[PDB]
Design a protein around this ligand. Structure first.
Ligand code: HEM
Ligand code: HEM
Ligand SMILES: Cc1cc(N)nc(CCc2cc(CN)cc(CCc3cc(C)cc(N)n3)c2)c1
Ligand SMILES: Cc1cc(N)nc(CCc2cc(CN)cc(CCc3cc(C)cc(N)n3)c2)c1
Ligand SMILES: C[C@H](O)[C@H](O)[C@H]1CNc2nc(N)[nH]c(=O)c2N1
Ligand SMILES: C[C@H](O)[C@H](O)[C@H]1CNc2nc(N)[nH]c(=O)c2N1
Ligand SMILES: [Cl-]
Ligand SMILES: [Cl-]
Ligand SMILES: [Cl-]
Ligand SMILES: [Cl-]
Ligand SMILES: [Zn+2]
Ligand SMILES: [Zn+2]
Ligand SMILES: [Zn+2]
Lengths: 407, 411
C-alpha cells in the first residue's frame, strides 16, 4: 500500500507508491513466495483501453481534456461496433516504450525512452514479415553501434489469425543431437532446429549455424526464410592475455533480439513484436557459454589454464568463469560492437531506479533477474531491496506456437 | 494442492505438498512479491493450538501419534497453560524443536546438517554471569580445536516480555568497528553502533582492526553486563594466498566460528529470545561479504592494486578477478590450519541433494533463492537454476528488534 525499500550498502530508503497501480498477478500469496519460479470480450476490453488511454493522456498532460474524452468516446464506439480498436501511432509508440519501462526483469531500462519503434501493422504475409525483420536487424545492428528497436506486427483478432515469429530470438544457433549422444551447437535450440529440418531447412550441421526464421502471418502455417548472412554481425572470441583462447573456435552474435513474447497495450495483444537492445557481457560468457545445458565450456577452458581441477575449493571454476567473461567483453570492444559489462549496467540501473522512484513513485524489479549471474554482491543491485509487481503495457510470455498451431 | 518446481539445468520436476503445513505470512500478496525484502506477550487463547500442533508433529515424528503418551502430554500441557499461562517443554521436545527450526530455515544453504546439532539446554540459567559461562562452553565445544561442531544454546523462554534473556551481540564472535573523527572507520563498519554501546557500558577498547568484541548479556530483563570471551577460546585464521606471497601482508584474519546470537527461536508457541547457534563458514561469507562489501572491510581495491590489474575500466573485470583471489585465499588458509570450512560449490551441491531428499521424505523444502544462491559465481552453482518455494514452517528462527531499541533501563 505504501512501501519502503532499503539499500543495505548505502542505507538509502525509498518509498514506492507506483505499486498501487499494479494490475496483473504475481503468483505469490501470503502463504508462499514464488519469486524464483520462471513462469509463476467487449466487456473486458473497454476497461483495459480506458486504463491505457487515461495514462497516455495523463503523460501528455491533457488528462480530462476534450481530446482525452473524444478519444475515449471514439475507442468505445469502435469496440462496440468492431469488438476491437486500432491504436494511434502516438499511442503505439508510448505503449511499446512503457512495456519496456515496466519490464521488471530488465536491467537495461535506463534506456527505455530511446526505443525506435517500427510499425509493421500493415504487414500481411510471411514474406512481408521477413522484409520488416531484416530491416530491424540492419537498423539495430548499425555496423556495431547498436540501437534499441522493436517491430510490431498486426494485433491478435479472433485468435485464429495470430502473427508469430516461431524463433525465440531473431538470431540464434542450431543444436543437433548426435549418434554419439552429445549435442552439437546450442543444446537450447535442439527442438526448434528439428521443426526447421521438418519444415525443409537444409541444416549445415555445424556448431554455430544461424537458424532460419520461421514466420507465421495471419494464422497461416509458418514459412522459412534465411536472414542475409551479411546482416548477421558476429564476433570471434579471443582473450587479451591468453593467445590459446582463440583456438576454442568460439564466436557469438552481436544482436540480442527476443522474438517470442507478447506485447499487451490497452487490452490489445501483439503476438509478434520482436525487440532488441545490446548484450550485457555475462549473458554470453556466463549463461550462453557456461551453463551445463548450454555450450558448457568451463571444463575445457580450465584445462587450457592448467588449474588444479581436482577439488572445487581451488575455485578453478570461478577462475575460468572470470576469464571467459573478460574474453567476451574484450572481443566485442575490439570489434567496436556495443556491449555493457555487469558493473556498469547495474550501476546504471541503480541510477535509473532512483529517477523512477523520484519522478514516477517506483520501479518494479525482479531481484532474481536483475542481479547478474556472477559476482552478484560486488554489484550495487545485490544490496538493493526491490519490489516486483506487474504494470501494463507489458511484455508477457506466451506458449510456443507449435503446441498451439493447427496445420 | 500440489505445487511443482523445475530445475532449468536438468529439467527435473519436484512436487511440493509441505507448503500446505505453512501457517505464518510471507510479506507477498497476489499483487506484490517481497522476495528481496530483508525484513518483511502471547495469550492462553493463541497458545494451546500452537502447542497442540507442535506436539502433534513431535508425536508423529516419533511414530506415537494418538498414543496414550501423546494424549497425556496434550492434557498435561493444556492444564499447565490454563493454570500458569505457559508451559515447559520436555528435553526431547526442545531438541526436536531446535533441530526443526534449523530444518525449516529457508535462508540456510547448510541444512543437510540439520539432524546433527548439539543442543545445550540452558533453561536453568538465571544470571548474566550464568549466560557467560554457558556461552564460553558452547564456543569451546563448537570450536573443538578447528574440527567445528554445530551447536545451539537455549536460555529460558519469554514469560511476560519484561524478563527476556537476550544476547545483545548479533554474533558471539565479531570484530569491533570504530568511527573516526575524519569519517573513516577502523575495524568492521557493521559493528560500529554495538561497539559504541560496549564502550558506553565500560569496555576498554584496544582500537585495532580486529578486536574481538565483549559479550553483552541480559538475563531476566535486567540491564545487560559485559564479559570478555577468554582469548584462548577464540580460534582465528590469518589469511594468506597459496601463490601470492604479499597477501599475508594485507594483515587479514578471521574467526573460525560463525555463531548467530540475535534471533528468536519459536517452538510450540514458546519464545526463546536468547538462543545462540553456530555451524561453520561457507568461504564466501568471509571472502565475498565480510571482506568485499563496500560497507564492510572493503578490500577489493587494495587487493587489485597489489595484483596490478587494470583498474581504469570496470570492463577489465578487475573486481571479479580480485574477488576470486581473496576467496581462494580464505579457503586455502582455513584448510591449511585445519579449521572446517566449505566452498560454495560443495555447499550448494550438498543442498540440492538435501532438497531432493526432503521433497521425497517430507513433501518439500522451503528455500529462499535470494539467500541460497551464493554472492559470487551464482549461475555456475547448481542452486541458481533451481526453482524454489519460500514459505514459513514452525518451529522457526525469527528476527527480533535489537534490544537497545526496546530495553527498559533499570539504571
Ligand atoms: C539496451 C540494451 C539492453 C540491455 C543491456 C538489456 C539487459 C537485459 C538483461 C541482462 C536481461 C535478463 C537476461 C539474463 O541476464 O538472463 C533482460 C531481460 C529482459 N529485457 Fe532487457 N536489455 C536491453 C534492452 C531491452 C529492450 C530494448 C527491451 C524491450 C523493448 C527489453 C525487455 C526485456 C524483457 C521483456 C526481459 C525479460 C526476458 C524474459 O523474461 O524472458 N530489454 N534485458
Ligand atoms: C553447519 C554449517 C552451516 C553452514 C555452512 C551454513 C551456511 C549458511 C549461510 C551461507 C547462510 C546465509 C548467510 C549469508 O551468506 O548471509 C546461512 C543463514 C542461516 N542459517 Fe545456516 N549454516 C550452517 C549452520 C546453521 C545452524 C546450525 C543453524 C541453526 C541451528 C543455521 C540457521 C541459519 C539461519 C536461521 C539463517 C538466516 C540468518 C538470517 O536470516 O539472518 N545455520 N547459513
Ligand atoms: C532485448 C534484450 C537485450 C538483452 N541484452 N538481453 C535480453 C534477454 C535475452 C534472453 C535470452 C535467453 C536465452 N539465452 C532467454 C531469455 C528468456 C526467455 C525464456 C525462455 C525459457 C525457456 C524460459 C523463460 N522463463 N524465459 C531472454 C533481451
Ligand atoms: C549458523 C551460521 C553458519 C554460517 N556459516 N553462516 C551463518 C549466517 C551468518 C550471518 C552473518 C551476518 C554478518 N556478516 C549477517 C547475517 C544475516 C543477519 C542480518 C544482517 C543484516 C545486515 C540484515 C538482516 N536483516 N539480517 C548472517 C550462520
Ligand atoms: C536486498 C537483498 O534482499 C539483500 O541485499 C540480501 C540479498 N541476499 C543476501 N543473501 C545472503 N546470504 N545474505 C544477505 O545479507 C543478503 N542480502
Ligand atoms: C530458478 C530461477 O528462477 C532461474 O534459474 C532463473 C534465475 N535467474 C535468472 N536471471 C536471469 N537474468 N535470467 C535467467 O534465465 C534466470 N534464471
Ligand atoms: Cl542470449
Ligand atoms: Cl539461465
Ligand atoms: Cl560473517
Ligand atoms: Cl550482505
Ligand atoms: Zn543459466
Ligand atoms: Zn513473492
Ligand atoms: Zn553483502
Amino acid at each position: 500500500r505504501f512501501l519502503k525499500v532499503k539499500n543495505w550498502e548505502t542505507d538509502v530508503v525509498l518509498t514506492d507508491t507506483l505499486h498501487l497501480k499494479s494490475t496483473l498477478e504475481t503468483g505469490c500469496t501470503e502463504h508462499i513466495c514464488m519469486g524464483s519460479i520462471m513462469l509463476p470480450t467487449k466487456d473486458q476490453l473497454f476497461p483495459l483501453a480506458k486504463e491505457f488511454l487515461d495514462q497516455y493522456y495523463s503523460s501528455i498532460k491533457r488528462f480530462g481534456s476534450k481530446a482525452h474524452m473524444d478519444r475515449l468516446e471514439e475507442v468505445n464506439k469502435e469496440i462496440e461496433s468492431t469488438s476491437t480498436y486500432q491504436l494511434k501511432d502516438t499511442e503505439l509508440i508510448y505503449g511499446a516504450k512503457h512495456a519496456w519501462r515496466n519490464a521488471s526483469r530488465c536491467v537495461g531500462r535506463i534506456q527505455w525512452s530511446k526505443l525506435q519503434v517500427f510499425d509493421a501493422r500493415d504487414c500481411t504475409t510471411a514474406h512481408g514479415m521477413f522484409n520488416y525483420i531484416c530491416n530491424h536487424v540492419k537498423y539495430a545492428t548499425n555496423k556495431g553501434n547498436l540501437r534499441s528497436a522493436i517491430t510490431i506486427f498486426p494485433q491478435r483478432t479472433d485468435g485464429k489469425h495470430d502473427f508469430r515469429v516461431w524463433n525465440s530470438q531473431l538470431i540464434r544457433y542450431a543444436g543437433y543431437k548426435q549418434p554419439d549422444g552429445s549435442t552439437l551447437g546450442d543444446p537450447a535450440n535442439v527442438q526448434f532446429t528439428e521443426i526447421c529440418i521438418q519444415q525443409g531447412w537444409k541444416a549445415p550441421r555445424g556448431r554455430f549455424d544461424v537458424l532460419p526464421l520461421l514466420l507465421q502471418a495471419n494464422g497461416n502455417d509458418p514459412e522459412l526464410f534465411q536472414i542475409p548472412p551479411e546482416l548477421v554481425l558476429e564476433v570471434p572470441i579471443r582473450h587479451p592475455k591468453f593467445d590459446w583462447f582463440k583456438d576454442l573456435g568460439l564466436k557469438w552474435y552481436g544482436l540480442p533480439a527476443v522474438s517470442n513474447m507478447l506485447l499487451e497495450i490497452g487490452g490489445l495483444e501483439f503476438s509478434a513484436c520482436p525487440f532488441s537492445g545490446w548484450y550485457m557481457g555475462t549473458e554470453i560468457g556466463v549463461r550462453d557459454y557456461c551453463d551445463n545445458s548450454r555450450y558448457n565450456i568451463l571444463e575445457e577452458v580450465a584445462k587450457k589454464m592448467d588449474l588444479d581441477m581436482r577439488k572445487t575449493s581451488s575455485l578453478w571454476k570461478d577462475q575460468a568463469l572470470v576469464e571467459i567473461n573478460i574474453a567476451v567483453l574484450y572481443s566485442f570492444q575490439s570489434d567496436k560492437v556495443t556491449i555493457v559489462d555487469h558493473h556498469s549496467a547495474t550501476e546504471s540501473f541503480i541510477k535509473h531506479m532512483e529517477n523512477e522512484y523520484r519522478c514516477r513513485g517506483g520501479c518494479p524489479a525482479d531481484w532474481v533477474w536483475i542481479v547478474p549471474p556472477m559476482s552478484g554482491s560486488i554489484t550495487p543491485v545485490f544490496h538493493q531491496e526491490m519490489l516486483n509487481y506487474r504494470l501494463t503495457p507489458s511484455f508477457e510470455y506466451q506458449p510456443d506456437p507449435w503446441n498451439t498451431h493447427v496445420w
